Assembly symmetry: C4
Homo-oligomer: 474 residues x 4
Amino acid sequence: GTLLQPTVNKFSLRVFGSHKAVEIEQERVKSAGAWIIHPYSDFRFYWDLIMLLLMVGNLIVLPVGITFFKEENSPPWIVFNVLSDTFFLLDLVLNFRTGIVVEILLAPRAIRTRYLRTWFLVDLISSIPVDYIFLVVERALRIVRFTKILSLLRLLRLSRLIRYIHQWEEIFHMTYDLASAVVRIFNLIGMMLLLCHWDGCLQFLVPMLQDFPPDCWVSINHMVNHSWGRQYSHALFKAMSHMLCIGYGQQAPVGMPDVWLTMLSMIVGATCYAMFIGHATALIQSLDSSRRQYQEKYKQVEQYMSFHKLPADTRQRIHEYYEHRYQGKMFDEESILGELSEPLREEIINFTCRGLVAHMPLFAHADPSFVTAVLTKLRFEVFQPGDLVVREGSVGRKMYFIQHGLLSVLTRLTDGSYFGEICLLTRGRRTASVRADTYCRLYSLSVDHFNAVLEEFPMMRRAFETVAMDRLLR
Amino acid sequence: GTLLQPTVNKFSLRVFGSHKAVEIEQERVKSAGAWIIHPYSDFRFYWDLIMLLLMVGNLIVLPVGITFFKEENSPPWIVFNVLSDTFFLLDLVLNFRTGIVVEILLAPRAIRTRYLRTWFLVDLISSIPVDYIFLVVERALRIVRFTKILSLLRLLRLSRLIRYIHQWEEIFHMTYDLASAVVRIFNLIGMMLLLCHWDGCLQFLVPMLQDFPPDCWVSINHMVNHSWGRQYSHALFKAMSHMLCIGYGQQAPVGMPDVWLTMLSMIVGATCYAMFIGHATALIQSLDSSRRQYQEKYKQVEQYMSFHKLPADTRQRIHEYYEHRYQGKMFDEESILGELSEPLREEIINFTCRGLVAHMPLFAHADPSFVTAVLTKLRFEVFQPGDLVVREGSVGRKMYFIQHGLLSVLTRLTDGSYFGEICLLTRGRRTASVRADTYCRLYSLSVDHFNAVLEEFPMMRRAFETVAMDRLLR
Amino acid sequence: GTLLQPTVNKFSLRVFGSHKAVEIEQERVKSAGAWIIHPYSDFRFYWDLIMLLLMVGNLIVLPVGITFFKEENSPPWIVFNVLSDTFFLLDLVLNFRTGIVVEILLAPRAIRTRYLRTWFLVDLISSIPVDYIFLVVERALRIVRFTKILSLLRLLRLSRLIRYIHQWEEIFHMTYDLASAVVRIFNLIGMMLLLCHWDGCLQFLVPMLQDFPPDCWVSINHMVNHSWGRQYSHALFKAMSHMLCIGYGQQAPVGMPDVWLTMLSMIVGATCYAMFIGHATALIQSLDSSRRQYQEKYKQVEQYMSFHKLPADTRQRIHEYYEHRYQGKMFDEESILGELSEPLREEIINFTCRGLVAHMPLFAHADPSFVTAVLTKLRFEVFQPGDLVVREGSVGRKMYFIQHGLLSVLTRLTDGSYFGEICLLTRGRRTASVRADTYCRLYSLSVDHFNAVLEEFPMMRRAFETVAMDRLLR
Amino acid sequence: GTLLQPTVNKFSLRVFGSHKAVEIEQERVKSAGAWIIHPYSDFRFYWDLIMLLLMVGNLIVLPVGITFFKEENSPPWIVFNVLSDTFFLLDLVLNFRTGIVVEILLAPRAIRTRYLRTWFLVDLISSIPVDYIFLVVERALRIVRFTKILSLLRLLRLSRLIRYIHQWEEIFHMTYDLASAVVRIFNLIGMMLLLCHWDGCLQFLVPMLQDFPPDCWVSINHMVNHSWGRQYSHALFKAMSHMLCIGYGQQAPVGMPDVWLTMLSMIVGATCYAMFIGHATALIQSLDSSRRQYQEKYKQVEQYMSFHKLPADTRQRIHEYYEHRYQGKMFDEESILGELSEPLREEIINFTCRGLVAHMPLFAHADPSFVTAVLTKLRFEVFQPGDLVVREGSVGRKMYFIQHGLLSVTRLTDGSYFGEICLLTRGRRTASVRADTYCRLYSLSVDHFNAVLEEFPMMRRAFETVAMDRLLR
Ligand SMILES: Nc1ncnc2c1ncn2[C@@H]1O[C@@H]2COP(=O)(O)O[C@H]2[C@H]1O
Ligand SMILES: Nc1ncnc2c1ncn2[C@@H]1O[C@@H]2COP(=O)(O)O[C@H]2[C@H]1O
Ligand SMILES: Nc1ncnc2c1ncn2[C@@H]1O[C@@H]2COP(=O)(O)O[C@H]2[C@H]1O
Ligand SMILES: Nc1ncnc2c1ncn2[C@@H]1O[C@@H]2COP(=O)(O)O[C@H]2[C@H]1O
């Protein structure tokens, strides 16, 4: 009895919010009882999965059954039509109690007026069997052709199929992350295949109603008395060749109703192929945008290089810097770390600098709170070999830690080491000079952040003082 | 008598400014009297709505009347031509007094020179009936063909139609918000349909003037003596098949003037179809850009994830954070709140936090000025379960309020609660530790903003002191 | 004698810099004398304008002269060929002394090696008349066909035409601001027209060399003995119909060399039409980008509106705010004013606020230096009616000036007025409350900027004190 | 013996990191011995370069050999098939020991399960010769047609070719900077040419198996007894004309299997041509984006100009300012200098201002450390002529240096400087400076100036002496 209520699911959590909002929605459904179908409930799922398959089966089978078969009084055809009319009438009956997303669950007022204003007439016309009525109520050939065109009123179920497919596609952008362009283009492919299947049946249907004049292509190809499969094959070939703008026959089409159907199918095919090109272009432009932005940024850089007329060796030095800095990846490290929360930043920086945790003895013994408080305030820097990181007699600004590479002070030291220590404490000038031997990834620490961390932790101040005196002894 | 002046309307307000600027424009119109038509006045509306319909009627009917009908001396055709010449001459007469937007309302100088420099000759040629003049002044078949080609000079009214349609489209981007690409593409569709309707009439017109040679397609299909409708149908089929690049006849076109018309229509159709593909692509790329930017941003995030070689569980934790933070929506909350004004921000934050207003007793009794002054300085934050928001023995930085979820301090508390209070007042370390039990939306308050609000309001300082002492008792 | 040197022009100033850099380049040219042609000099202009016209004339006329005419020994044809060979040999001779932009003006070393490495062979082959040599040196039909194919070596002048057209197009992005896509697409249109004109001549040329077999289309259409114009017309129709993917004949092409030419022209036409669609799409997407960014920004805003589930009246209030703030224009007022210089900002703000200059008596008497020093520090703000700008008992933050609209303090005041005065001086709370009656554009002044301007100007401090005492009297 | 290990190369450095990480990967390979092939090693290079050429040769030659030739028992055809089966079986054998990038080098567990889960069946089917088996085991015409369709199972080597081409293309985005769209579009061109070459062979193959009915196009064109080259030419013309949406014959195709092949090739050609248009559009939009952003920015500027209804002379003054400021180049000087490191900034500013170094005597004698410390804190500014840079009786804010142009206060040209004494005296502006031409200037802020004086005390006295000299002037 709870199947009319929306259950607790991932889409339910992402739409309603917490479990309490889901319970509020369930109580709003339970305001009335067995009169309201919530539009996110599993009953609408369990119904629409049936109705989509039935609608696809009818929209494929029904024109082939109308146009190509001669004796329309076969029993399983009548059984199939009766079943289709039954389910598509029960669908409207269940629609009457259903909810409407704009979620207006007011049953006696909003539902009835929203149907009678928007989408009751089309579903009502497509639901009921019109041809059986005129058969019961009622020059026989005009009557039979009239009943055939009336039986073509079943084709308005397409408008309901489109509505349910768009409701599904609005649902499954949220339970699964899907590229939008893929959904759009497979929707368009289904529409195009369906339209070509219509035009085949139509271009056989029109010479049927005129009792095959000698001007029509069926009489010219002498294929009146073949089986329905081969006639369907030739008609579909003709329709697809008009639709993809080919050029079908030897002669121009002579009969006047052939000309206008031809022109109609040509226009429809040209517009559908144009929209298909558009969707394919929009899909292709969204494949390697991360690599494309890197390309645009380097175009911008060499534009700036050209503006100041820089030398060639400097230009390739810049190029090597970008190749060993970004590695073809155009990411904004500031905004991504800004969009996150604090524990995510802590976990990321721990995973990136557990090597610096492991090699350094000062981080081996201290509290991990202190370790994270240091690590959250570093900055990643990359140097090229031959460069002097710190020159002697500087102002003194920053400390450095060593991720990779080895560095030479004119006394060499490899990765896992550190320098820039004592000049922050003594506040003096730079004692020795540090060179870059290779590409060396470094993390840097600002002095204001350093004093803030020392204000947060007094014992590591004495630890740095002891290791600075040891460094002075070295 | 005020219909020459621009009235007070929505476009009038968005162009001129206040009502006073509209009155200044009305006085500038009333500088002269019954000699100037302001280009935004309702008289130009009331005139152009007639003239567009007349121009469309002529540009559809006139070639069909020229080419297909034999006896051109029928009375209602002459009546129709006389009416068309009358209205399109009166249009030029009313153009003489009209205003010109660049609004140059100087009648005797700017209007006359701007016509005689830019667009007087084309309207003058398209206005007057040339063929009736040569009929009055004046081997009869060459004369009749000469009059037919002279009567084709009516087709230069297209240049006026384009000018008025662009003036309308420049108007209605401002009274109604319209997607620009839709306007462009329906303008192009109208142009393409009109060009195909020209080419049908033209490809029947050329074998008319040569008295139907046996090489032409009309003689080959033996359709000289059919009605004009069927001839128009076959000619339009031929023109559309050349235009959409199909391939029309059995043979190659034999007569030399057929070949060049064929090649001309093929080139025109290829270029029009190319521009149609371009407009369709530009329309499709502007449908789901909000969802596309979210996709690009997450591609950027997983690019950054790949750059530091993060583990899988961390990567899916980041993915869950974005799914429960942005919900597929790529919006910039900083810039949108920055572009607004202060009362809009106040109304938005009141509607988002009236729940926090309702549950908290401290906000229930105080002045709503104080309530808004608190609420404008919050920050929205989202945590994942298991995370520790405040760890014991911290520095003490911020207060938190609880939108959703429940939180556990190791003493549980659900939504509508608050914490982080006493550490701002005591300026000490963190007493207890707070965990996250679920996804919990929190609003955070900075201590500097907190002290500023206390400086603005002294009594709530004592209120916070009392509730902090109560919290210490707890 | 100075025509070899680059003169002082707009492109010369935008490339070289000042007049002194132009004189340095002129001295670098005058390092040698009458041996170097600078590539920006007017002599290269005066030469290339001739050579482009000659190259276009040859690339149009020469295949029509080779393929369609029978007697190739007519005198003016020989005169035309001798003139063409003369000018295209003199072009290579003048190329030897010319300069090369990469500007390497080193004549004996860089020019000779850069020709013999890159582009000497193609120009040498296309320069000299090959067929006259084999005619002087030398089954006559094989010899004549051999001379015809040798005379087709003139077609390599296309590579020189492309080089000079790209050098021109690189020049005229700088003297005139041109949309790049227009240049690209007209270059492509010229290339496509030229290729179709080649294929017409080629598809007549191949049945010439086989003495018109009965399998070829010329013999089938029985058009061997027509004039050259009609043969050229049918050949061009055949080539264009293959190129635009149409379908030409009744039968499939029977002869084997016809099939491969057909397939070649089909592939070339398909690729050219694809690139034409691409250029048209890229041109269309760059037309109304300013209006498109406004559309995307409002999509973003209503996305944010949907995220917090805002009410409808609030949503339309936001919509009215944007309509009366930006007017469909997506401009960044911060970055544009940031990119300018100081006197440009001063001139812009003077033109926007001379009304506030004129109505205010305090700005009427003071120094215009003081006036600009005030005006450069304002901020433009827009309010909706009913809003309260200043509520009584505020903290006191800012002064306001009134561009448009009228405002009511509960004592009304219209545009050109001002308020927010005395609370900056007294540093107290807000005395009276100000409402918004209409849309009212306001300029706001911050108190820190206000005190800075008072520090710059001491007498206007006393002026504000007097008018504040007058306001207190009011 | 080290060819199974990944050597020290540029891609190796850009993937692994330092030389030590390369040695760690080499030790991880050397965990086992002569049982593991590392997927970046030169042996996989030396193997795949052979296998791509063999796969292309087979995918071109084999359908032409099957469909058009009558006697399929010629010796060099059998030799060619035996060689192809040999190398494509040895490829699977060497695949068994190979590594897999996701680098899972675990040989007995990850490799076997990853093959038997993902890509063992297709390579196994495409490897072994099926037709020779049915020939050994086994109305002869049905048997021969059955063997022909079984010999068409060689065509599944395309799936391996695609995998190796994508592995190569993933490698060479890193050793060479390549535009991605060019790689995509040449991959698509190769695929389209291959598909058209398939459809030609197929549309001749189907009337072969029906012993040429009179309804087929071969019998209608009376070309059964021509050579194989001319038959291949007509079949390829028919296939390409269906593929590029042309319209081939006089009549509609009469036989029912012709109709469905026609419709299939038409659909395939339409989709391939659509994707080709898409790739061409995406390539064209990425050519002159630097010039396009300048265009969009100036559209934005004239939008702002229109919003405040500015006069024409002001608008063209703004236009001249942008033409002499950016020169059509839409670059962000802040972010580019921000993304670099400190020595790169120092080298760039030295190369841009060595003229100011050379003309100024105060920079001629001082330490180059001081020179760079001054030069890193300048700002580039551009003025229009007639403008007054400093008006008399100002507040006093900044110093200026002169890159180009000449300025009139007592005139002075490029290489000069002003704005000096008002920073020291902290007073108002003494004289007024005009702009005579377009003049590029570098500006110096007073807070940065006092910071540099705090870093260097002797140049303080140098500025004091030259300021007293300026007062004497
Ligand atoms: N043993 C050592 N090896 C290398 N550098 C050292 C040593 N001892 C001290 N230093 C210096 O200690 C300094 C601390 O900060 P500086 O940035 O001034 O530069 C650092 C190094 O040059
Ligand atoms: N009854 C309580 N339940 C939970 N937390 C409390 C309680 N009383 C005080 N606190 C703490 O009060 C602190 C105020 O600021 P903190 O951020 O230090 O962390 C807050 C809580 O841990
Ligand atoms: N005659 C007046 N009419 C309207 N407002 C006034 C008048 N005199 C003083 N004020 C107030 O002067 C105040 C100066 O700063 P406030 O922002 O506090 O708000 C301003 C006004 O409310
Ligand atoms: N000989 C001179 N020629 C030009 N300007 C000078 C001279 N001597 C001093 N100055 C001024 O010195 C001032 C220093 O800073 P100011 O920006 O006030 O403006 C500068 C100049 O106007």
